[PDB]
Amino acid sequence: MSSLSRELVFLILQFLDEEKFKETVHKLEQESGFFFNMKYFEEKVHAGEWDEVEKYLSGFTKVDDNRYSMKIFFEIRKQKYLEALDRHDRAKAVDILVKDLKVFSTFNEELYKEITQLLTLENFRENEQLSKYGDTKSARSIMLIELKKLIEANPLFREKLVFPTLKASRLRTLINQSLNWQHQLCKNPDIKTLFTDHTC
Amino acid sequence: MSSLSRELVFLILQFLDEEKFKETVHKLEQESGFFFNMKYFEEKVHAGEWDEVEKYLSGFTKVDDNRYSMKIFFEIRKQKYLEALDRHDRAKAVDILVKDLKVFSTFNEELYKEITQLLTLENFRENEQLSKYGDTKSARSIMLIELKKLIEANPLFREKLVFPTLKASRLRTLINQSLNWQHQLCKIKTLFTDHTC
Amino acid sequence: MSSLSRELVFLILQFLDEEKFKETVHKLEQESGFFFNMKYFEEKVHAGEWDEVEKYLSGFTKVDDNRYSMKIFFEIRKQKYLEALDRHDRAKAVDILVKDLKVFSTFNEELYKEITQLLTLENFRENEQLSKYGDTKSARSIMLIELKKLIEANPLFREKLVFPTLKASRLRTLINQSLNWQHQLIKTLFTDHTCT
Amino acid sequence: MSSLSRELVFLILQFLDEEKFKETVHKLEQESGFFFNMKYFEEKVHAGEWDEVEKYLSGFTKVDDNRYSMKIFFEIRKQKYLEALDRHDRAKAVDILVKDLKVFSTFNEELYKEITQLLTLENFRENEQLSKYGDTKSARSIMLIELKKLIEANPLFREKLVFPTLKASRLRTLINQSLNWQHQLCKNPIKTLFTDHTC
Amino acid sequence: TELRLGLPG
Amino acid sequence: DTELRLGL
Amino acid sequence: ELRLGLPG
Amino acid sequence: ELRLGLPG
Ligand SMILES: [Zn+2]
Ligand SMILES: [Zn+2]
């Protein structure tokens, strides 16, 4: 990708936001990987929408790219697991533990075992490390604070966290110039389409 | 002059497509509701991705907008239900039946009942109307062919099914022109602020 | 079997109760089919022990023996089903409906459908026939009274509902006499006793 | 219990068997705790009827009575658990692990953990200690052989495994004598057993 | 409807 | 087009 | 023998 | 920091 193409994506991002196509903004952020939107990320984590959280992240890093992003996913999947326990859905909790958390066992055998054994507790708050764990809303928040730090420190995100500065509607402004350029080649004083060059 | 903005959305759709941002293309189709992509739709229906199918459709029509769009959703939710039966997940089949299919009961009380009763069959193929129903892959295909016809006849899709014809990369070409207009005032670093020499 | 044998079963029933083998009493009631124990039946219906209820009944009648016994099983399995809906276990409710209630569909086609359709209601009390159905403890009791009447009218049970009255420990008393007979003219009950 | 009473129970057991009331026989075995029926026990183990197995055993011993009886229950509940995993029902496997197997954790913390960790395997046969477990049918059989030994060696069962030998229908024969004793007091030449016969 | 099947009675 | 169907 | 293993 | 715990 040229820096021109990269820049064009940003213009498009601004346009999409101005027209309030909200979901399209974040799919473009994700698939281009040019801008990580914190505000959005926080919003989704607080809402506990974990499938979207992991999907949004997957546009910026894989699980094993580096230890920062590895702790990021670990935290996310851990909280997913605990919420499953807290609604007493042990079928879901085990599914998470095998599909999501197993990748971390290679690197930590002992923690995975300790994580597994929470399945047999009346309340995981019986474990002394998890004893101070509260309402779901509060746990998400605590973890979010940690995630923000992990993202800000992650070398893969470091140049992606701040939106560039632009006058409103830059794309519409550029489009305007192309219409000016086209007609300035015409032999007379109506723009019908953007689809084919204008003439008079 | 709103055809400008609308046309700009199309340019952006083509750009996104060329850059192969696939999910962004289809969110834009959906949220703008300007272009319905059949090819994409079929692909999702074949894949049994039902939440996305309904989500994509929701940008174009609601369930009660008209009799076409009503049969469209009904067929989708019906197949969803049968698949649940066919994998023997009766808890999911009932959840579908209450949440997704119930809205149709008001105007067909009897059909809803006939559908509900399929829960008590060993195999819903014991019902003579479902008697020829085979493979999941095949059922989806049969139903898809009908959906296409229903969508093409739905007046809410009027002029949304055919992509406009444009030269490749028209957006990049226009952008190209704005850089031409900017420098012509000379004698490129950014697209963010006008260029000078 | 004989009426002696039949009578001996009753003695054994009394003995078992006095020695407080509670479960063994009722298995004997069931397998002999000689005495249907109402008190026990009520208790199990109230407890919602449906497999035990059907198992106990199975010693006295099959489902299709007569219209009385048919309605008895139908009522039980219906309540089983409703409880499943009421705890929102729709997976169990469908299982009950196919395995337990389907048999009634042949001669009750419409009713089976009407019962199936309760699956799609937020609350089956939306159905006007089931609208007055109160809390589970109460529904069981209501239904129990009807079961009791169906049983009392059932020709297969009507001659089984009354325990004979006996002095305490009649069995032990008869055993005692056999030892009297042997000595004329303790070691064991296993082989006849003898002297010198 | 008197030994008269205890013997009377055995007479009744023989009677119940001859009348082929099979379920009543085993409930009496269980509730009296006088006779443990191996043949019946085996049949239930092979059938995987675990609630009946534990119910039948509960009449003879509790889980913590002695090390033999403890290993017996442990083996039963372990196999219960493994079968649940083997049919891929992890919801049931976890329910078992908390309700049935947790009691054994006090006595071995580490083994409980190792067993719990089988939840995360594709196949518990990946564990080398379980690598040989090939069939639910075969596993049950293997385990049964061990249970038989544990029961035969359990000092709480040692006086309970062999039915006394009796002439057929001893109860009926005794009953007969009571009718003879009753009539020999009546002068002179029985309908009910409920009250003494006369003439 | 002594022995008639309905829901419930 | 597989059944059962509301028309169209 | 009276040991809790798995399984044998 | 980096290392994985079972904390907040
Ligand atoms: Zn011109
Ligand atoms: Zn004597």
Coordinates of N, CA and C in Angstrom, one line a residue, chain B residues 92-169:
Chain B
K92 N -33.0 -25.4 20.3 CA -32.8 -24.3 19.3 C -34.0 -24.2 18.4
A93 N -34.5 -25.4 17.9 CA -35.6 -25.4 17.0 C -36.8 -24.6 17.6
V94 N -37.0 -24.8 18.9 CA -38.1 -24.1 19.6 C -37.8 -22.6 19.8
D95 N -36.5 -22.3 20.0 CA -36.2 -20.9 20.2 C -36.4 -20.1 18.9
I96 N -36.0 -20.7 17.8 CA -36.3 -20.2 16.5 C -37.8 -20.0 16.3
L97 N -38.6 -21.1 16.7 CA -40.0 -21.1 16.4 C -40.8 -20.0 17.1
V98 N -40.3 -19.7 18.4 CA -40.9 -18.6 19.1 C -40.5 -17.3 18.7
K99 N -39.2 -17.1 18.5 CA -38.7 -15.7 18.2 C -38.8 -15.3 16.7
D100 N -38.4 -16.3 15.9 CA -38.4 -16.0 14.4 C -39.7 -16.3 13.7
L101 N -40.3 -17.4 13.9 CA -41.4 -17.8 13.1 C -42.8 -17.3 13.6
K102 N -42.9 -16.9 14.9 CA -44.2 -16.6 15.5 C -44.9 -15.4 14.8
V103 N -44.1 -14.4 14.3 CA -44.7 -13.3 13.7 C -45.6 -13.6 12.6
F104 N -45.3 -14.8 11.9 CA -46.1 -15.2 10.8 C -47.4 -15.9 11.2
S105 N -47.5 -16.2 12.5 CA -48.7 -17.0 12.9 C -50.0 -16.2 12.8
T106 N -49.9 -14.9 13.1 CA -51.0 -14.0 13.1 C -51.8 -14.1 11.7
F107 N -51.1 -14.1 10.6 CA -51.8 -14.2 9.3 C -51.8 -15.6 8.7
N108 N -51.0 -16.5 9.3 CA -51.4 -17.9 9.0 C -51.4 -18.7 10.2
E109 N -52.5 -18.8 10.9 CA -52.5 -19.5 12.2 C -52.2 -21.0 12.0
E110 N -52.8 -21.5 10.9 CA -52.8 -22.9 10.6 C -51.4 -23.5 10.2
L111 N -50.7 -22.7 9.4 CA -49.4 -23.1 9.0 C -48.4 -23.1 10.1
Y112 N -48.5 -22.1 11.0 CA -47.7 -22.1 12.2 C -47.8 -23.4 13.0
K113 N -49.1 -23.8 13.2 CA -49.4 -25.1 13.9 C -48.8 -26.3 13.2
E114 N -48.9 -26.4 11.9 CA -48.4 -27.4 11.0 C -46.9 -27.5 11.2
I115 N -46.2 -26.3 11.3 CA -44.8 -26.2 11.4 C -44.3 -26.6 12.8
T116 N -45.1 -26.2 13.8 CA -44.8 -26.6 15.2 C -44.8 -28.1 15.3
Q117 N -45.8 -28.7 14.7 CA -46.0 -30.2 14.9 C -44.9 -31.0 14.3
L118 N -44.0 -30.4 13.5 CA -42.8 -31.2 13.0 C -41.9 -31.6 14.1
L119 N -42.0 -30.9 15.3 CA -41.2 -31.2 16.4 C -41.5 -32.7 16.9
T120 N -42.7 -33.2 16.7 CA -43.0 -34.5 17.2 C -42.8 -35.7 16.2
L121 N -42.2 -35.3 15.0 CA -41.9 -36.4 14.1 C -40.5 -36.9 14.3
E122 N -40.3 -38.2 14.0 CA -38.9 -38.7 14.1 C -38.1 -38.0 13.1
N123 N -38.7 -37.8 11.9 CA -38.1 -37.1 10.8 C -39.2 -36.3 10.1
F124 N -39.0 -35.0 9.9 CA -40.0 -34.1 9.3 C -40.3 -34.5 7.9
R125 N -39.5 -35.4 7.3 CA -39.8 -36.0 6.0 C -40.9 -36.9 6.0
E126 N -41.5 -37.2 7.2 CA -42.7 -38.0 7.3 C -43.9 -37.2 6.9
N127 N -43.8 -35.8 7.0 CA -44.8 -34.9 6.5 C -44.7 -34.9 4.9
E128 N -45.8 -35.0 4.3 CA -45.8 -35.2 2.8 C -45.3 -34.0 2.0
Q129 N -45.5 -32.8 2.6 CA -45.0 -31.6 2.0 C -43.5 -31.4 2.0
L130 N -42.9 -32.0 3.1 CA -41.5 -32.0 3.2 C -40.9 -33.3 2.8
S131 N -41.7 -34.2 2.1 CA -41.3 -35.5 1.8 C -40.1 -35.7 0.8
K132 N -39.9 -34.6 0.0 CA -38.9 -34.7 -1.0 C -37.6 -34.1 -0.6
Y133 N -37.6 -33.6 0.6 CA -36.6 -32.8 1.2 C -35.4 -33.7 1.6
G134 N -34.3 -33.4 1.0 CA -33.0 -34.2 1.2 C -32.0 -33.6 2.0
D135 N -30.8 -33.5 1.4 CA -29.6 -32.8 1.8 C -29.8 -31.4 2.3
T136 N -29.1 -31.0 3.3 CA -29.1 -29.6 3.7 C -28.6 -28.7 2.6
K137 N -27.5 -29.1 2.0 CA -26.9 -28.4 0.9 C -27.9 -28.2 -0.2
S138 N -28.7 -29.2 -0.5 CA -29.6 -29.2 -1.6 C -30.8 -28.3 -1.3
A139 N -31.3 -28.4 0.0 CA -32.5 -27.6 0.4 C -32.2 -26.1 0.3
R140 N -31.0 -25.7 0.8 CA -30.6 -24.3 0.8 C -30.6 -23.8 -0.7
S141 N -30.1 -24.7 -1.6 CA -30.0 -24.3 -3.0 C -31.4 -24.1 -3.6
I142 N -32.3 -25.0 -3.3 CA -33.7 -24.9 -3.8 C -34.3 -23.6 -3.3
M143 N -34.2 -23.3 -2.0 CA -34.8 -22.2 -1.4 C -34.1 -20.9 -1.9
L144 N -32.8 -21.0 -2.2 CA -32.1 -19.8 -2.7 C -32.7 -19.3 -4.1
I145 N -32.9 -20.3 -4.9 CA -33.4 -20.0 -6.3 C -34.7 -19.2 -6.1
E146 N -35.5 -19.5 -5.2 CA -36.8 -18.9 -4.9 C -36.6 -17.5 -4.4
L147 N -35.7 -17.4 -3.4 CA -35.3 -16.1 -2.8 C -34.9 -15.1 -3.9
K148 N -34.1 -15.5 -4.8 CA -33.6 -14.6 -5.9 C -34.8 -14.0 -6.6
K149 N -35.8 -14.9 -7.0 CA -37.0 -14.5 -7.7 C -37.8 -13.5 -6.8
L150 N -37.9 -13.8 -5.6 CA -38.7 -13.0 -4.6 C -38.0 -11.6 -4.5
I151 N -36.7 -11.6 -4.5 CA -36.0 -10.3 -4.3 C -36.1 -9.5 -5.6
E152 N -35.9 -10.2 -6.7 CA -36.0 -9.5 -8.0 C -37.4 -8.9 -8.3
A153 N -38.4 -9.6 -7.8 CA -39.8 -9.1 -7.9 C -40.2 -8.1 -6.9
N154 N -39.4 -8.0 -5.8 CA -39.8 -7.1 -4.7 C -39.5 -5.6 -5.2
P155 N -40.5 -4.8 -5.2 CA -40.4 -3.4 -5.7 C -39.5 -2.6 -4.8
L156 N -39.2 -3.0 -3.6 CA -38.3 -2.3 -2.7 C -36.8 -2.5 -3.2
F157 N -36.6 -3.4 -4.1 CA -35.3 -3.7 -4.6 C -35.1 -3.0 -6.0
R158 N -36.1 -2.3 -6.4 CA -36.2 -1.7 -7.7 C -34.9 -0.8 -7.9
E159 N -34.2 -1.0 -8.9 CA -32.9 -0.3 -9.2 C -31.8 -0.5 -8.1
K160 N -31.9 -1.6 -7.3 CA -30.8 -1.8 -6.4 C -30.0 -3.1 -6.8
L161 N -30.3 -3.8 -7.9 CA -29.7 -5.1 -8.1 C -28.6 -5.1 -9.2
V162 N -28.4 -4.0 -9.8 CA -27.4 -3.9 -10.9 C -26.5 -2.8 -10.6
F163 N -25.2 -3.2 -10.5 CA -24.2 -2.2 -10.2 C -24.0 -1.3 -11.4
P164 N -23.8 0.0 -11.2 CA -23.6 1.0 -12.3 C -22.3 0.6 -13.0
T165 N -22.1 1.0 -14.2 CA -20.9 0.7 -14.9 C -20.0 1.8 -14.8
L166 N -18.7 1.5 -14.4 CA -17.7 2.5 -14.1 C -16.4 1.9 -14.6
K167 N -15.5 2.8 -15.1 CA -14.2 2.4 -15.3 C -13.6 2.0 -14.0
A168 N -12.6 1.0 -14.1 CA -11.9 0.6 -12.9 C -11.3 1.8 -12.1
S169 N -11.3 1.7 -10.8 CA -10.7 2.7 -9.9 C -11.1 4.2 -10.2

